[PDB]
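Entry 14. Structure prediction run on the chain below.
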Amino acid sequence: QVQLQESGGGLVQPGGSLRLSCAASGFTLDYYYIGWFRQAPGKEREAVSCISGSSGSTYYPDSVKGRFTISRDNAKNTVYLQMNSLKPEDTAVYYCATIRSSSWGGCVHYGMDYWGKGTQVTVSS
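Output returned:
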């Protein structure tokens, strides 16, 4: 039942912006925490943005804090990651993940229960 489907990947120029969407099915945002993760080529997968489905409270790691913002639309059951001022080092597959807020334990890859299949973002150079 619980599934996530990311979309919006494509080629961006450096300094450009891109918004990714994560469509939730099998659940509603209110009971969960939604996270965005990324894997740049050769690199370990790392957290990027978490959001609370109910309150909309957010968590941003140092590397993207300021440039990346996550938002959620309860009515559309969708979580969005806005990326501003993109850098070539942001090239990665961006994954959506979620966990029931009852089990919420921080914005870490080992604390997620369901994973999307990813969507590739490439910042040309």
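The chain is about 0% helix and 50% strand.
Filed with the rest of this week's runs.
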